Amino acid sequence: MENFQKVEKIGEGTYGVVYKARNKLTGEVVALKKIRTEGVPSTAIREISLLKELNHPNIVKLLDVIHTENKLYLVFEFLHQDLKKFMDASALTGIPLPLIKSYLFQLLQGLAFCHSHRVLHRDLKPQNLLINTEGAIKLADFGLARAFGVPVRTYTHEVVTLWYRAPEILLGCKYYSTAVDIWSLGCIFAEMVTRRALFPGDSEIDQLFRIFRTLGTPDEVVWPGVTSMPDYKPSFPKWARQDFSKVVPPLDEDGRSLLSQMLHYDPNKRISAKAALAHPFFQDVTKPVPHLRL
Numbered sequence: 001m002e003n004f005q006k007v008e009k010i011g012e013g014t015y016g017v018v019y020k021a022r023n024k025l026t027g028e029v030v031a032l033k034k035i036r037t038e039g040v041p042s043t044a045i046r047e048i049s050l051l052k053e054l055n056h057p058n059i060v061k062l063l064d065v066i067h068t069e070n071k072l073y074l075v076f077e078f079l080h081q082d083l084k085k086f087m088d089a090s091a092l093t094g095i096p097l098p099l100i101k102s103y104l105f106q107l108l109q110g111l112a113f114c115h116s117h118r119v120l121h122r123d124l125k126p127q128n129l130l131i132n133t134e135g136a137i138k139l140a141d142f143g144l145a146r147a148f149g150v151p152v153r154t155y156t157h158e159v160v161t162l163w164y165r166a167p168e169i170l171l172g173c174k175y176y177s178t179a180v181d182i183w184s185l186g187c188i189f190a191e192m193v194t195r196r197a198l199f200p201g202d203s204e205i206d207q208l209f210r211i212f213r214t215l216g217t218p219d220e221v222v223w224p225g226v227t228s229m230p231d232y233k234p235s236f237p238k239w240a241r242q243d244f245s246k247v248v249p250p251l252d253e254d255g256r257s258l259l260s261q262m263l264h265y266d267p268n269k270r271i272s273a274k275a276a277l278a279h280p281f282f283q284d285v286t287k288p289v290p291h292l293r294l
């Protein structure tokens with residue numbers, strides 16, 4: 001708008017476009033997200049407005065929500081880089097384990113907070129995790145499907161990333177639980193460690209089968225009720241589970257144990273964010289400073 005002077009486009013999420021902008025008055029630098037649309041829902045505004053009262057050091061602060069002319073603007077505190085860029089920038093040397101551990105620990109604190117407040121992210125991915133020069137990492141772009149449905153595209157027509165989608169979502173479950181966020185974080189954790197996406201599916205079935213090929217095709221023994229899921233097909237190939245040491249080398253056993261609990265098939269067995277914070281893997285967690293080139 002005119003109260004804001006765009007500085008540059010930051011990207012085009014799954015619900016809109018994000019810009020870096022400065023408040024002509026306050027001089028405050030912010031991230032301005034524009035969402036598209038026959039008037040904009042009212043219940044959505046209420047649910048978004050809710051998110052404004054969510055404050056935690058590991059959640060990007062939502063400063064203002066502005067409804068105007070079918071366009072919905074969200075003003076967020078601005079951070080300088082996202083985890084996708086940082087991972088790309090660290091692909092040659094890898095992110096130091098102590099930083100990986102610090103980032104995972106802070107993300108679980110943010111989720112434990114969201115989850116205890118009945119808030120689900122639903123679309124965690126490297127691009128939605130922001131970092132600063134101080135070593136903090138925060139959850140951003142909370143989806144908002146609980147009040148908007150499942151995104152089929154965008155304004156410029158973009159390819160939705162399925163790499164971090166929990167298996168119950170892929171199998172058609174209609175009700176997501178906090179477990180879907182733990183699954184995504186697990187996938188992200190693995191990616192920071194190996195420097196390659198864990199499950200880089202290029203379609204929904206491919207995403208599902210990449211998961212099956214690595215963790216084994218689920219059955220009623222490991223996931224009671226799985227064969228009754230909406231999109232479960234008795235015809236799915238039955239792959240055997242892969243030794244977990246081949247999945248995320250050279251991650252230590254504490255790390256592999258935690259990841260295995262974040263990646264359990266059964267949403268009910270999957271570790272909670274709170275329980276994960278108590279895992280032995282975090283016994284020596286610290287808060288290192290990342291080498292950020294801005």
Ligand SMILES: Nc1nc(Nc2ccc(S(N)(=O)=O)cc2)sc1C(=O)c1cccnc1
Pocket residue numbers: 010013018031033060076077078079080081082083085086127128130140141
């Ligand atoms: N708050 C906030 N700050 C940002 N800055 C940023 C992000 C990435 C870079 S990047 N490619 O590393 O250069 C630079 C600055 S995005 C963002 C969001 O709220 C947000 C993020 C994702 C989706 N929807 C909203």
